[PDB]
């Protein structure tokens, strides 16, 4: 599959599949190859990628779906990140 | 003498199960599922439960001494339904409808 | 079942899925396809433990139960330079702020 | 009203099975269409249910009133039993959006009155305060049902 590089504010490169990234409507618009984010930190953006994996996998899944975990501390930043990325 | 009637008793229950009297006999087919219906109080009130499926088994297992004992269980079935529910309840209305059929046949049994 | 991984070197991180049946060498082919680096110039680790090319990901310890989509298991990576392998180095992510009073 | 149970008085044995981590709240739409909440189901549990033919159901989280799925759909309607076999209702989580899932966590850790004490964008205050409502979701499905005709 086509891969895309998602860079955090603190300079952490995250190589995910293009299909997985298109879950985000913001990224969908940004492309139509390499994408950069000035605000989002590493630990937040890493968790966003884990959602893409989780979303792509368990969508249209007859296998019962587990709860997507979000620790109390990251919740606030991840909420804003999710709102920004539109997903 | 008695075996003649016990076979007629089976004939009655077959009509009670039959599609003819389906509309108002369907609650009394199988035992009262306390879990499904959510009746925590039922077991306290009704000491001796009964249903048509239970009676059917007893007929086939030759557990009724005579046709008189068969009636007691059929009556116990309705008795329990009347005991538990209020007068204006739907299951009671159906209980009466089915009972009035049974009573008609049980009365007109040969001997 | 499938295992979900985070292949990390320095500040790089590859999110990619694999099988328990698949091998470490087959995993290095994924790294080659992305980072242009051939398997002979790769060293894949599990925590501190170095992994063999012949052994499977299931044999290495990566189970589908432990390594899930939402919680993928990390896989260390170290390249070769001047015909000598670097020691495994993974920069950690940034720290979340301490839990506010309202969230306590 | 559109979405409502039919007073059929025709039996339909059902099995609710909470295959989700939430404490499920079974909700039954009455003959007028008003939802009636039934006793909850713990996580990873189930039990037999005596519903009737053409009876609408929907399942939520007892705590947060988050929407759940039953047989990969929102509304559940029992058929008639075939050879008196029970109609199964597999209650599970949906694939929540990262935003709505983030809200659920913030909602659970922060009281309603502390929503405007959080260092976030103005718009997110409305989103948090906009809790998941049953009546609001029924109004959507009703309009979607009309659009389908």
Author numbering:
A (entry chain C): 16 to 47, 58 to 112
B (entry chain A): 349 to 459
C (entry chain B): 1 to 104
D (entry chain D): 61 to 209
Reported in the publication:
PROTACs are bifunctional molecules composed of a ligand for a target protein of interest, and a ligand for an E3 ubiquitin ligase, joined by a flexible linker. Recruitment of a protein close to an E3 ligase hijacks the ligase catalytic activity, leading to the tagging of the target protein by ubiquitination and subsequent proteasomal degradation. Our first crystal structure of the PROTAC MZ1 in complex with the E3 ligase VHL and its target, the second bromodomain (BD2) of the bromodomain and extra‐terminal motif (BET) protein, Brd4, revealed that the two ligand moieties of MZ1 (the VHL ligand, VH032, and the BET inhibitor, JQ1) lay in close spatial proximity within the ternary complexes.
Macrocyclization was achieved by adding a second linker to “close a circle” between the two ligand moieties of MZ1. The structure superposes well with the ternary complex VHL:MZ1:Brd4BD2 (Cα RMSD=0.6 Å) and recapitulates the major PPIs between VHL and Brd4BD2. Conserved contacts include the previously reported electrostatic interactions between Arg107VHL, Arg108VHL, D381Brd4(BD2) and E383Brd4(BD2); and the stack between the canonical WPF shelf of Brd4BD2 and Pro71 of VHL. Collectively, these interactions result in a buried surface area (BSA) between the two proteins of 681 Å2. The cyclizing part of the linker optimally fills an additional cavity created at the interface of the two proteins next to the ZA‐loop of Brd4BD2, which is in good agreement with the MD simulations. Closer examination of the additional linker revealed potential clashes with the ZA‐loop, which could explain the loss in binding affinity with the BET bromodomains.
